[PDB]
Structure formats: structure tokens, C-alpha cells
Amino acid sequence: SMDKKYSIGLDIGTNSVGWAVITDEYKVPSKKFKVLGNTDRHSIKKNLIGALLFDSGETAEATRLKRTARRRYTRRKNRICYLQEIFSNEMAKVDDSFFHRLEESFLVEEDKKHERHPIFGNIVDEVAYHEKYPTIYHLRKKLVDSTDKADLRLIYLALAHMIKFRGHFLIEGDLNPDNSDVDKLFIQLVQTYNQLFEENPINASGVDAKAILSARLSKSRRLENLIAQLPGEKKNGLFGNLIALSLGLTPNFKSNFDLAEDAKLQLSKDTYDDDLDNLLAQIGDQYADLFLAAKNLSDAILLSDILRVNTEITKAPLSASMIKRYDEHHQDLTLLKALVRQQLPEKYKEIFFDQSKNGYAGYIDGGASQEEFYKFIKPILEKMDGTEELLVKLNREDLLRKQRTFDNGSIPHQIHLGELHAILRRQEDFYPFLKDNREKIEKILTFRIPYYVGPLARGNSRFAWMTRKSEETITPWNFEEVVDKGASAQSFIERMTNFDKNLPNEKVLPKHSLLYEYFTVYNELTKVKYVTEGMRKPAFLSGEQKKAIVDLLFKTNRKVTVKQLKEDYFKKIECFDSVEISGVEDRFNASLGTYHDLLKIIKDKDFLDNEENEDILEDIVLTLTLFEDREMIEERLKTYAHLFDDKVMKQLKRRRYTGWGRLSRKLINGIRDKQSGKTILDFLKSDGFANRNFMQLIHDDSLTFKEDIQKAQVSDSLHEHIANLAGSPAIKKGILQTVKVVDELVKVMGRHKPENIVIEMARENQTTQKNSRERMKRIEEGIKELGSQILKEHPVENTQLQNEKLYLYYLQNGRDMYVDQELDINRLSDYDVDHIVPQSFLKDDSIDNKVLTRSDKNRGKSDNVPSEEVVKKMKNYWRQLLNAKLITQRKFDNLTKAERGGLSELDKAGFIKRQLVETRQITKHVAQILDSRMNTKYDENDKLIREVKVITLKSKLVSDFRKDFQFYKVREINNYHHAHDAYLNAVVGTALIKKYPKLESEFVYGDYKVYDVRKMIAKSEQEITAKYFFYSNIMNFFKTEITLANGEIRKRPLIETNGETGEIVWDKGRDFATVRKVLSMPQVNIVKKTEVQTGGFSKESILPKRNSDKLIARKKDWDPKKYGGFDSPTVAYSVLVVAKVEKGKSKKLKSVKELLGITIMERSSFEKNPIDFLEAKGYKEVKKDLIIKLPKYSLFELENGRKRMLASAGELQKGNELALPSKYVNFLYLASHYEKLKGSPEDNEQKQLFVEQHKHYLDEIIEQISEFSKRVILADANLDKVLSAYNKHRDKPIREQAENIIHLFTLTNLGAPAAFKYFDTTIDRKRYTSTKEVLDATLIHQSITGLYETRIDLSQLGGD
Amino acid sequence: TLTRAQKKYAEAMHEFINMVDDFEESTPDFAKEVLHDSDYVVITKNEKYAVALCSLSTNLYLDEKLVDYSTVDVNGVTYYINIVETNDIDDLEIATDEDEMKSGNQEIILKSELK
RNA sequence: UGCGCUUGGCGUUUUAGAGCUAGAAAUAGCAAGUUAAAAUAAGGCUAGUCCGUUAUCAACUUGAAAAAGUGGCACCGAGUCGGUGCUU
């Protein structure tokens, strides 16, 4: 051969990139490759196919949380330092070393440089103090109340404990009823509820919420007493579950909103936040204000229950109430011990003495939670007399409570400030320096760094944007006069705006932009259809209808129901009687919330509607979204003070907003259509008979928006190029790894660019029955809408809803879809499932396109959609199902196409688009880069010369192709299929680009002549000349004989060719062989990208002290034998070390060749001075040349082709892949698919014969595995154990025997060994814990493809 | 926001309700540090503690190290949410009766976490 | 769909809150518990009320680093890649 034309295949992933090279003949070439190294092998052959594997790429966010965690702790340490500094000069007078003792509180007696008692320094004064002040709160109350001069250390402690743990800043300004009281926040709740629900208000005008909620009763009682005042609210209503949430319970919002999956929400859960976001997404942004009014109430109750004081007894409600809790804990404990001595004295020791148990000892000493604890003593209290009071406190959750606890989130820094402020005012006469710093101290507590200002850096922080006003250290006092608040904010706005993906360089609107809201309503409104009597076909809205509706319904309602639209407008305004509506269901999702919010506060309807006020109005929203901050908001509304009352103005700033949209104002209006001068939003309003939608407008190539977007994505350097594209961080790594592979391959190929690069992107997102509930949910609501008794008569269960025949039975209400016939639920095996739009026209296997009939003959004689007769007979029946949502609209239409003359050219041209064009925007970006990288030359007119055509395929075509021709895939076997998939794309892609070149525009990146598809299409079968097809399914030319919807068989020639070129595209007999050949090849290049670990030094569990020296100190001086520490430290990379070390009492140098794990923490050190580091860690006579870096997954080959991968310094992973013969592959596919075949009956039987006639392949397969494990896995005990186990079930079914044969592959799988089972029987993994063999073994360095290697025999080290 | 490990557990938690008893006492989470360090989350039903199964290195020794578990209660019976910490190589023990324990335990789910 | 800024409550760790009676001890009987300090990636220099867990990484060669370099082809096979005519 001569042919140096070649195309490349690629299957891009998050953990893999399969790649292949092919020739014009669909062959995978073969080459010898220069093998560098010190071994004797100086070249080997490799097939040009393989796949790169790699650990996923991880998000920054994880690091961010660590960063703020770190920032918080550092700036708390500074608060205290501001205190001590003020105190210190005076304190020195009173105690020389008082602060110092605190500094060293942590340390053991042996290491303290001062006296071991911290506050006072002698055991007498200390022990006294603790009997006098059992908590800090006793000290705080006394200082807050008393009129005596107090010791200056004690004043410090009190103040330092309010400052250190200073509570929340959720509430701005002084506390008052509207921000802190339980009733007010109750009112805001119902107000938020009714705003949502004008139709069904709650009125609670008489209702006394404060008292009901506040009183000391179990959460669940208070919930009943409240719903008790609200007739027409159910205890688990939407309003009832909202109070439940408010009390801290776990309500299920499932029923409340008709959800498929339940929505249990609990305010104390950390995951509540995105548990809420889970619910919100389903039910929309609108309800967020409810759950936030619930949350604030939640704070209000908890805070109400923490401060249990009558005020004015003390200026320290908090401390006084903790003391109460202390006393109460004492009382109740004493009694309890009484009641256990008396009644259950055998259990006294365990409960109060054992810290292993969940009893009191574990509660205090064993780290039990309050929750674990109650649940321990609950049975025990219940067994005893005299527990009545204790059970009440328990079930109220008020028994034996500690003062520092999970609740205190809800304690506002203002309260702390109250006590802080009091103590100063008592003492400031006894200590003038406190009079003089009173305002400084209070500032230490109350000052907060602004959200906008950010880190207070000086040019050494990548994160910070703040601008100084002077070069001096920033302190909470000088802040306003050192930091340029305005400038710093301004740089804030710029950084925290995201740009429009479609049109970057342009900021995204706030999610609550009136314009974003008008836009979003006009987009939903544009797809709505209606029928009055004599309605012709189902009509769209006029622009004038739309502009009246928004004017009447939308600018009069927060949310508009169909009923108002059906009744409020159609009957009322157009003087209709009854109007069917389609294209919306139940109610509108998008409404002008921001219009109504602004109407309430501004009470000037003309102003909102002026539409020249839009600018003023859009800046407003912009500031209330940008800023939480009260001060800034005031500064930033200053210039609309004239326009508005000081009643409204105040009320304005009290409206806040959160969230950003996907789009730019310039998107929605700024750009225009060249031909029409109509913006996007301009089209949404009036588009005529043809009523386009925003997604359409961008896609629609007849307009200037699609093209300007393309022209607008403009972005230089590489990583910047990679960085820019949207998509997950893991997929950016794969895109980057893809392009490197292409570069290596091009290099491999002589630096010739290929003819084409076929792309597809593999999907590995099989998260879960998410869909199996929805199936049931669809049926219930469906079967209820129809008022049928089917589910009663035939029991419901949603897991057997995975049998499609069973699924369609129910969706059709137990009837034939093509006849007024019942089906027999039992006898479904007999029935045929039919595709409405035949397979020949397009490949659609969706339930949407399938129906159950007693025999597919009932459909009609056609090769079309079903016959005009069936349509006219069932259309009513089908209409009922559609109104009941058992069938989709598209499905109704498809059945009823015959009515409309059946499948048109336009229909067909649509199936073609459907099949070719890749819908995911991220592959297009991947295409652009590669096209950009590959194509570099311009011609003599400055037209780009496209030497390489970069093609993107839907994954489906290949996946369909494998299924169609029996090139089956079973991931559980090995990793080759990644590479195979790439090959198969390359093949299917190039064929297609030969056979249909005019279709290039659809599937080739570039700018090409767009061709009306219809022209391609033939009007008839006999028409077949320059007509591409009469049958839509574009993959037809591969098949020899295709079946039509009516059993007829249309044949095709072995040798297809493009008619116009005459180029030869496919020999059906010859070419498939080439494919089968490629797939069964044993040598495929599987490279695990080796990686140095990065991140945390070790596990994050601070452990208690051990003799063992493994644990790692948390501060250089803190010996873990004394102070505890971290246990396991991550190894960054290992390092082969060859040196001689002392071996016995003699101290004689024995030569060693060892493997050393360099911890992430040690890396710095060892990488500055590698020998010195190694020498301090014991090795001597180290040889510098010898040392080799060995990261994770480093590859060794042992004797007999056995290979290992380095997991750590002491452990290996299996390094071999099991290329099973192709014949056993499809055997194991079919076998384990035996029942749910999803194929036509006559071959669905044909394949089952093949399995029954090849059950001797089962035994042949085990011996495949057997010889493999003996040779490489070398875990004999396990293979013995399975070898018996397959004997033990040789007579179990082939579908069961196979499906377990697939688990067994874990044993031979590449990577670390895992535990697995055959049937009941379970195999324990055999771990390769010796890295000794490797040292004398052969290393192998691989390029990305694994094609260029360097082989290093390690048994030649040990000498000179 | 949310711990990388934590999030891959919360979803793990969804799947267990997916088994479904509409149990009604809401599921508990261990401290973030325990979760990052711990390698695997397993739930064992029918009132028995999770896992601890051996691994025979190149006879058999214990492989999986436990941490805190919560006896969440379905209408009938305790379902522990046992948390399993994968074992570091040097540290290991040798099992006795336990091989019997691994065989006679039925566990509804095991989900990889760190990965 | 990323990426970013403020701030809290727990939690964990060590110390500090004189344990007593009886007994040679082994040990048993009792008392007590609710709080605080401190650290919260070791640390780093650029000394900031900054920064320290993301991306990135075969080997060998040049560079200070971005970055640049380094490995014929044809056929006939196929148990992880084998052989052979040719090129040099």
C-alpha cells in the first residue's frame, strides 16, 4: 500500500479518551515503534488504536471552602489580639504573665514555662473561682449586673468570650420587633404565603402566634395548637408543613406539590441548603421567599426559647438563661441518679460510668450528641416510676442541656453586644482605660469586613481586589478611612459579574430583572395554542393578543392560571364561550414578580409602564441584587431620592434580591436581525402566523442572531482557549488530553494532518429508579384523570414498570392501541410492540414512539404512519389519553399524521437533522479548537484552507451501529471499548461524509453551503438521479436488507457508492469483516495517565494521643505521644532509592534498593535538597543519578507479560487488560439480555437458539479467565474458590450464569483489586502488598498514546 | 456550600430513602472530617452493624475499618448507616469468627465516596 | 457551570476545673460531670487583619521560564504484538 491519508477517531470522556487511526479502507494500521532504553528490545509493533485513562478533574470549590475556613480562623485570632493589646498594659500591672499562661493553655505541665493554673496561677484561687462561677455565663451575669469593681482578668475573660464567639450578623441595625419578634416574623410568613396564594388566603388576624409557638411544649404539640387556629388548614398542609419546618421538624413537602420523589426538609440539616435548592428547582424560584420567611421564624423561636428571662432583672438575658439551664441540668440529674439508685441499680454503672455507651458518660466524655443520648435513656426512663417530669423535658428536647450547643447559630451578635456594653459601663469608673477604649472594644465586636471589600491584601493576593486609601495597616477603627469603600466596591461589581456564554464581554442580568422577566413570559407565551368552535387547525397567539394579555393578566397578577386565561380573557374580552387551550398546562411558570414587587412599594402604575423608566428601574434592581449591605444601598439610591417619597424610599431599600440569569440585555434587545431590524425580544412579541421561540431564534439560521453569536464568541493562547469553554472541570481535562493525543498522533503519522477527525462524547452519568417512580407517578395521575379502575383491578408496583410491554399496557389503560379491544395483562408475551413512525424513516425507540397491539398488523397496510382508517376510529380515544397526559402531543400527532397526508418531505428532512446534528454545545467548542489547531493555512485570497474536516457525531449513531451489527459492548470486561468506540465513529463518520457530502453543513465544523434537505429527498420509492433518499433513516445504506413497517423487505447492493462522486463508500460483505477484525485484535494501547497527588497532607481527623509514632503533629513542637494528631498522610509520589544503610548493632552498611513514599508535606523539603533529605531519613551513600520519580500508576512489567501499577510506596494495582475473543463478547451480551431483548420476535428467537446452542461457550469462557488469572493475577485461592462456585451452579439458567460471569471480571480488571460475588458466594480481594518484585523488574515510560515508550530494566541497578 | 465528600454522601443518602420505608426520622450525617477520611458508606439493615470484611494480602487479615453508625429506624427495625474507612496497608489484623460474619450479613448498599 | 467575597454554631484535639472513704495492695463502695483556654492543614515571606488542598505533570535533550526539541516504510500473521523482502 501507499495510502498516507488517514482519519482519526475519538471518544472523549471524564475518565477516558479512546482514539483510533483508520485508512480509507476502514483498517487500523500497524507500525514498529522505536523503543528507547537500556534493555535489548529496540523496536515493537503496535496497532494505531488505544485509549487514555485518567482520574477525574476536581472543582476548585472544595479548596475555596478550605480557604475561607482558613480566613475565618485567622481573623478571629486577630480580634482577641486587639483585646489583649488594649488590656495588656494595664494587665501587666495586675498579672505579669496572665496572658502568657493562656498562650500556653494547651501544653502539658512538662512543657509549660509558667504555672499550670491559667486564670489566677494558684490552685486555691482557681478552685474557688470554679465553685463560684461554674460557667463563663455566671461570670458574665455577675459582671453585667454587679456594681462592684471586678478583678481585671475576669473582666477580660467575659469580654474575650463574647468577642471570640460573637454570634451572627443576619440582622442589620438594632434589634426590634419587625426583625426579631416571633409574631412579626409570623406575619411576614403568612404575608409571604398569601402573596403567593391570592386565591386561597390564610387570615390569622385574631391568632396569637407568639404565645402558641413560644410556650414550652413539644415541637409537635405547638404544631397542632397553631393549625388548630386555622380552620381549612391540614396539619400536613403546605402551611402546616411550613410551621413544622419552623419548629425544626422534618415535614414532607412531597404531597403538597404532587412530587414524584419525597422532599423531607429539616432546618438543622447542613444539606438543607441544597435539599432546598432540589425542591426549589422543581417548584420554581417563586417560593424561595416562603422558606426564608420560615427560616427567620426558625431563628425567632430558637432565640425565644434560649432567652427565657423576664427582662430588666438583668441586662444579660442570655447569660441568665444559660445559668437557669445549668441549674435545671443539676436538679434533674440529681433526681435521675436518685430514681436509678432506687429502681434500676444494676444499670447505674453503665449509664454514668461507661464512656463506650451512649449513656451519660458517652454524652459528656464519649462525644455522644444530645440526640444519641436521649435515644439511649428514653427506654430506661419509660421503664421507671417518677420519670414523668424527665420524659416531658426529653420529649420537649429540654433535658440535661449543655450551654455551648448546635442551637446557638440563632443568637445575634447584638445580644452579645448588650452584655459586652453593660460590663464596660459598670467598670469604666474603676478602670479609666476602659472608659477611654469603650468605643474601641465595642467596635472590635461589631465591625465586619464587607462582602464587597474582600481580603485586605497588598498586591500579594490573587483573590483580592480592594483599593487602599493609604499605606497603613488596616484596623477595624481606621477602616472607613484607610479603605476606599467606593472604589473597592466598584472593582467588586466588575469581578462578580458573569458574562453571557453566548455573548461574553457582556454582563449577565440579575435574575430578577424586569426585562429578564418580561422576556421570560413572552417566550413561554409564544408557544401557546387555542381552539374555539370552527377553529381550523390549533392556532397561535397574535402579537396584539399577547400585548393585551400581559397588560391584563400579567400586570394584574403575580401568577396567571389557565382558568383566568380561559375565562378572564377569552370569554370576557374576545367575547368567546369556551376556548380549548394547548401548549401550557395548569398555570404559567414565568411571571413578572419584579413588576408586582415594584408596584406595591412605588404605588405608581404609570411609572412602571412608562418604558422610558426601564433604565432607572433596571439599575435599581441591579443594586438590590448586587448588595446586601445597607450603607452601600443607601449611597447607591441617592439620586432617585427626588423622584420618590421618604415613605417609599425607606421601603425600597428594605426590598432585597438574589440571583443572576444566563443572558445579557444585549442578547435580548441589543442585537438585531439584519433583514428586519427586529431584536430577539422584538420577535417574541410579534412574529405573525409563524411564532418562533428563543431557543429557535438562536438555532434558526434564517436570522442574524445565530451568526452574530458565532461571530461574538471570539475569545489566543491554549489554556485560555481550553479555559473559556463551558462545561464541567473534568471535561476540560479530557478536552485538553484529547488535543495532546491528536498532536502525538499527527506526529506519529509523519506530521501529515488527517483527512478527518471524528468526535463523539461518551456519556457516563447513570446516577441511579428516578424514572421508575415517574413512570408510576405518570400512571396514577393519568389513571385518575381517566377515572378508570385499572389500578385497583390490577395491582400497582413501580419496579416491574421497567418491562416496556407492561409499561405500555398501563399507559393505554389495558386496551389495544389500534383497536377497541382489551388486552390481557397476562398474555403480553403474545403481543407486538410497534413503532409509530417506522424505523426505516428514523430511529426512535422511545416510549413516545411505541405502542402495544395484539399484532402489528392492526396498524394498517402502509409503510407510513398508521392507516387513515385506524386514525379515524381511535382519534377520540387517543384524544382522551392526551388530555390525560398518558400520551404526549408529539405522539398524538404522529399517530394522526395520516390524517395530514402522512410523512412529508418536511417531516423526513426533520428526521435527518435529528440524527446528524449534535445538540450539545460543548462538542462544538471542542470541534472549533481542533479545527483551529489543525487548519492553519490561508490561500491567495485569505480564505482558510480546511485541510482537515472535523466531524462531530451523535453518540447514538455508533451505539445504534454496534447494536445493529452485533458489535456488542460489555464494559465490565476491560477498557478497550473506549478505543473501539473511537474507531467505530471514525468509520461511521467518514462513510457518511463520503456518501452524503452535501449534508456537510450539518455535521462538519466550518462554514459551508446549507442545502434545503427536501431537494435531496425523493418524492417516491421508484424515484430512489440526484436524490439522496426516500427513506429517512440515514444509516440505511449499511444494511443489506431493510424491513418496512408492513413486513416487506427492501434490499440494497453490497457495494454502495455516492452517485455523483462515484466514490466507493462501503462493501457490505467485505467491510464488516474489517471491523470485526479490528475489534478482536489483542494489542490495544491502554495508558493510565500517571499523576502526582495534590491536596491535603493527610486525613483530617485530629486523633487522641498514642504511643505510636505514626501520627503527625499539628504544630512543629507538638509531640503526638503527648498531644494527638493526624494519622495517614497522602503520598505525593514515591521515589526509588538505592543506597546502603545500617543493618545491625554493628552499624555495618548493607546495600538496599528500596522504594520511598514522599508525602505531600515533605515534597518541598525533598525537592530542594533530595540527598540531604534522604540522608536525614537514614539512607547513606546515596547515588544521585539513580533516584527515579515514581508517581501513582507507574507501570512495571514482570516476567511472562504480567504487569503492575504503583498505588503507593507499598502497594500495587493490577496492570493487565484481558482482551477476550470477540465471539465470547456478544455471547455474554446476548446471554445476559436473554429476557429483555427488545428485538423482533423472529430473530429474538434466532438469537436465543444461538445462546442455547453455544452454552459450551460458558465453560470455554471460564477457562479463558482461568488461564488469565493463573498467569497474571496470581491469586490462586480465589480462582480455586470461583472454580468450584461455577461448578455449584452449572445447572442454573444461562441468563443467570452469564450475568454472574460478568462480575467475575472484576478479578481480572485493571486497577486495584475489589471484592466481588458469584451468586451468594463472595470472594475477598487479593491485595498486592509487596513492592519488592518491582525493584528488579522492568519500568515502562509511556507517551500519552502509549505508542512511544522507554524501557528501563531495574535489575541492572545495584552496581556502579 | 458543601464538602466534596459530604455531597457524594448526601446523594448516597437519597438512594437509601429510595429503598423506601417512608421511615420518617430524618437521616443523619457525620462530621465533615470523618467523611473525607472515611472511604465508603454502607448501610446494613435488619439490626446489624456494617461490614469489616477481610482482605488477603500477598492468611487473611481484616480490610475495612469501621467508624460511627446511627441506628436509623424503619417502621420495623434498625437500619444502621454504617460508615466504613478503608484500611491503610501496614496496619492490619487477622480475622477469626468474622469470616462467618461477612457471609451472614445482607447489606442494601455500598457506595464509593472519595471517588 | 464554572469561579469568587463576607460571617456563624457545632465538632475534634491538650491543658485547667485538689476526686473522696476503705484497703498492704489486688480492689470495692461512693462523689463529680453542664465551663473555659488554645490549635483547626506543618507552615511560608512577600510580613499582608496576605498566602498555603483547583487546574497543570511519560521519558531524554536545551533553556532562567513561558516554551523548544527527540523515535522509515511494505507485506503476511495474531493471546497483549509476532516476523520478513526492502531504506540507511
In chain B, where the domains are located: 1-115
In degrees rounded to 5, what are phi and psi of residue A999?
-75, 10
Q: Which residues contact A1328 (CB under 8 A, 6 or more apart)?
A: A1204, A1211, A1212, A1213, A1214, A1313, B57, B58
Partner residues linked to A1196 by β-bridges: A1204, A1339
Rounded Cα distance, A211 and A167, in Å: 26
Q: H or E stretch including A146?
A: none
Q: What are the backbone angles phi and psi of residue A567, rounded to the nearest 5°?
A: -100, -45
Please give the Cα distance from A509 to A499 (Å, whole number).
9
Contact B1 A1329 (CB under 8 A): no
Catalytic residue, from A413, A721, A835, A1233: name it: A835
Task: Check if B111 contacts A (Cβ < 8 Å).
Answer: no
Residues A524 and A619 both lie in one domain = yes
- C-alpha–C-alpha distance, residues A669 and A226, integer Å: 50
**Pick from A269, A767, A1101: CB nearest B37:** A1101
A409 membership: H or E segment, kind and range: none
Beta pairing partners, A11: A18, A760
Residue that finishes a domain, picked among A380, A410, A440 = A410
- Separation between Cα atoms, residue A757 and residue A8, nearest integer Å: 5
Let me know whether A676 and A580 are in one domain.
Answer: yes
Same domain, A958 and A876: no
Q: For residue A16, give the 3-state DSSP assignment.
A: strand
The amino acid sitting at A806 is L
Beta bridge partners of A760: A11
Question: Residue A134: inside a domain, yes or no?
Answer: no
Cβ neighbours of A313 (radius 10 Å): 10
Q: Are residues A1054 and A967 in the same domain?
A: yes
Angstrom CA distances, A910 to A610, A1029, A1048, A1250, stand at 43, 13, 24, 38
Across the interface, do A1277 and B56 touch by the CB < 8 Å criterion? yes
Same domain (yes/no): A680, A535: yes
C-alpha span between A51 and A351 (Å, rounded): 60
Measure the CA–CA gap between A686 and A678, rounded to whole angstroms: 10
Strands (E), A450-571: 529-531
Q: Dmax over Cα atoms in chain A, in whole Å?
A: 111
Residue A365 and residue A355 in contact, taking contact as beta carbons nearer than 8 Å: yes
Residue environment code for A1058-1092, b if the CB has 16+ CB neighbours within 10 A, otherwise e? beeeeeebbbeeebbebbeebbeeeebbbbbbbee
* Exposed/middle/buried for residue A1019 (C-beta within 10 Å: 0-12, 13-18, 19+): exposed
* Alpha helices in A678-829, H assignment, sequence order: 680-685, 694-699, 704-712, 718-724, 729-748, 770-785, 790-793, 804-811
Residues contacting A347, CB < 8 A, separation 6+: A340, A380
Q: How many domains does chain A have?
A: 6
A383 CB-contact burial (10 Å; exposed 0-12 / middle 13-18 / buried 19+):
exposed
Residues A666 and A521 occupy one common structural domain: yes
Q: Do B58 and A264 touch (CB under 8 A)?
A: no
Cβ-based neighbours of A816, under 8 Å, separated by 6 or more: A822, A823, A852, A853, A854, A858
Distance in angstroms: CA A182, C1' C70: 76
Strand, coil or helix: A947: coil
Between CA A295 and CA A757 the distance in angstroms is 54
A929 and A874 housed in the same domain: no
Tell me whether residue A972 is in a domain: yes
Name the nearest CA neighbour of A515 among A658, A636, A669, A633. Answer: A669
Q: Which three cell numbers stand for residue A1345?
A: 498514546
In the chain, the amino acid numbered A606 is D
Q: How far apart, in whole angstroms, are the C-alpha atoms of residue A296 and residue A180? A: 8
Same domain, A518 and A651: yes
Residue of chain A minimizing CA distance to B54: A1324
3-class DSSP state for residue A1067?
strand
Asked whether A116 and A106 are in contact (CB, 8 A), the reply is: no
B89 → closest Cβ in A1096, A1211, A1325: A1211
Whether A848 is covered by a domain: the verdict is: yes
**Cα–Cα distance between A376 and A372 in angstroms, integer?**
6
**Ramachandran angles phi, psi of A529, nearest 5°:** -115, 155
Cβ–Cβ below 8 Å for B55 and A1325: yes
Angle subtended by helix axes A152-164 and A61-94, to nearest 10: 170
CA–CA distance, A1123 with A1139 (Å, rounded to integer): 35
| Count, residues in chain B | 115
Domain-terminating residue out of A364, A390, A410:
A410
Query: What burial class does residue A17 get, using C-beta atoms within 10 Å of its C-beta: 0-12 exposed, 13-18 middle, 19+ buried?
Result: buried
For an interface test with B, which of A1329, A1331, A1332, A1334 has the most B Cβ atoms less than 10 Å from its Cβ? A1329
CA gap A728, A752 in Å, rounded: 32
| Grid cell locating A146 | 454587679
Q: What are phi and psi of A548, to 5 degrees?
A: -80, -40
Helix, strand, coil percentages for chain A (3-state, nearest 5): 45, 10, 40
Written as one string, the DSSP assignment of A862-905 is -SSSSPHHHHHHHHHHHHHHHHTTSS-HHHHHHHTTGGGTSS-H
- CB nearest B2 (choices: A274, A371, A1327): A274
Q: How far is CA A303 from CA A180, A214, A264, A296, A811, in A?
A: 9, 10, 24, 10, 52
Task: Give the C-alpha separation, A1025 to A1028, whole Å.
Answer: 9
Gap between the Cα atoms of A383 and A466, Å rounded? 64
A49, three cell numbers? 488504536
Helix axis angle for A413-427 and A432-446, nearest 10°, is 170
Whether chain A has a CB inside 8 Å of the CB on B106: the answer is: no
Q: Which residues of A touch B7 (CB under 8 A)?
A: 274
Q: What is the Cα–Cα distance from A569 to A554, expressed in whole angstroms?
A: 11
- Give the separation between CA A713 and CA A686, rounded to whole angstroms: 28
CA of A59 to C1' of C44 (A): 25
Phi, psi of A255 (to 5 degrees): -60, -35
- A319 Cβ contact partners less than 8 Å away, ≥ 6 residues apart: A137, A138, A140, A141, A144, A419
Neighbouring residues of A793: CB distance < 8 A, sequence distance ≥ 6: none
3-state class (DSSP) for residue A208? coil
Angle at A1250 between CA A1249 and CA A1253, to 5 degrees: 80
**Taking CB atoms and an 8 Å limit, are B58 and A1325 in contact across chains?**
no
**A325 shares its domain with A284:** no
Q: CA nearest A196: which of A258, A239, A259, A250?
A: A239
List the single residue in B with minimal CA-CA distance to A367.
B68
State the cell numbers at A217. Answer: 411544649
Resolution of the determined structure in angstroms stands at: 3.3
Radius of gyration of chain A (CA): 38
Closest of A1035, A1031, A930, A1023 to residue A991, by C-alpha:
A1035
Distance (Å, whole) CA A973 – CA A967: 14
- Asked whether A1071 and A26 are in contact (CB, 8 A), the reply is yes
Cβ partners under 8 Å of residue A1002, min gap 6: A912, A913, A916, A917
Helix ranges restricted to H, A383-484:
388-395, 413-427, 432-446, 479-482
Q: After which residues, if any, is chain B broken (C to N > 2.5 Å)? A: 58
Specify which residues B66 forms β-bridges with.
B84
CA at A713, C1' at C8: how many angstroms apart?
42
Whether A871 and A939 share a structural domain: no
Tell me the sheet residues that pair with A1352. A1339
**What is the DSSP secondary-structure string of B55-75?**
EEE---EE-EEE----EEE-S
Cβ-count burial of A742 within 10 angstroms (0-12 exposed, 13-18 middle, 19+ buried)? buried
A1144 Cβ contact partners less than 8 Å away, ≥ 6 residues apart: none
Provide the strand spans (E) within B18-106.
40-44, 54-57, 61-62, 64-66, 71-73, 78-80, 83-86
Assess whether A644 and A562 both reside in one domain: yes
Block residue for cell numbers 418531505: A905
Closest CA relative to residue A1292, chosen from A1231, A1246, A1236, A1245: A1231
**Distance (Å, whole) CA A637 – CA A1173:** 62
Query: Are residues A559 and A686 both part of a single domain?
Result: yes
Q: How many CA atoms does the CB half-sphere of A173 hold within 13 Å? A: 9
Distance of CA A1109 to CAs A1024, A1105, A1179, B31, Å?
A: 82, 10, 20, 26
Distances (CA, A) of A133 to A137, A143, A156, A326, A404: 8, 11, 15, 11, 16
DSSP H or E run through A580: strand A580-582
Kindly state the DSSP code that residue A1270 receives in the 8-state scheme: I
| 3-class secondary-structure state, position B108 | strand
> Which residues are paired to A1137 by β-bridges?
A1154
Residue of A375, A1274, A1324 lying closest to B54 (CB–CB): A1324
Q: Single out the residue of A649, A640, A632, A488 nearest to residue A172, CA to CA.
A: A632
In a domain, A28, yes or no: no
Provide φ and ψ at A1141, rounded to 5°. Answer: -135, 160
Residue of A nearest to B33 (CA): A1100
C-alpha A1041/C-alpha A837 separation (Å) is 19
Rounded Cα distance, A1170 and A1163, in Å: 9
Q: In the sheet where B54-57 sits, what is the strand order?
A: A1326-1327, B54-57, B61-62
Longest dimension (CA), chain B: 46
What is the residue type of A1288? K
Is A11 a known active-site residue?
yes
In whole angstroms, what is the distance from residue B39 CA to residue B84 CA? 6
Strand A850-853 and strand A832-835: the pairing is antiparallel
CA distance A307 to A806: 60
Give, rounded to a whole angstrom, the gap between the first and last alpha carbons of chain B: 19
- In angstroms, the first-to-last Cα distance of chain A is 49
Query: Is A114 a residue of the active site?
Result: no
- Cα separation, A715 vs A722, in Å, equals 10
- CB-hemisphere CA count at 13 Å for A1074? 17
- For residues A26 and A1080, what is the distance between their CA atoms, to the nearest angstrom? 15
Give the domain extent around A1294.
1214-1336
Q: Residue A143: CB partners within 8 Å, gap ≥ 6? A: A150, A154, A155, A158, A422, A423, A426, A427
**Rounded CA gap, A1119 and A546, in Å?**
75
Answer whether residue A222 is part of any domain: yes
Answer for the pair A847, A804: CB distance below 8 angstroms, yes or no: yes
- Distance from the B68 Cα atom to the nearest Cα atom in chain A, whole angstroms: 10
Nucleotide nearest to A662 (CA to C1'): C1
Do the domain assignments include residue A249?
Answer: yes
CA A243 to chain centre: 30
**What 3-state class would DSSP assign to A1131?**
strand
Subunit contact B1:A1100, Cβ cutoff 8 A: no
The 3-state DSSP class for residue A1196 equals strand
**How far is residue A510's CA from residue A661's CA, in Å, rounded to a whole number?**
6
Coil vs helix vs strand at B33: helix
Label residue A141 left, alpha or beta by phi (over 0 means left) and psi (-120 to 50 means alpha): alpha
Q: Are A867 and A859 in contact (CB under 8 A)?
A: yes
Helix count and strand count (H, E) for chain B: 3, 8
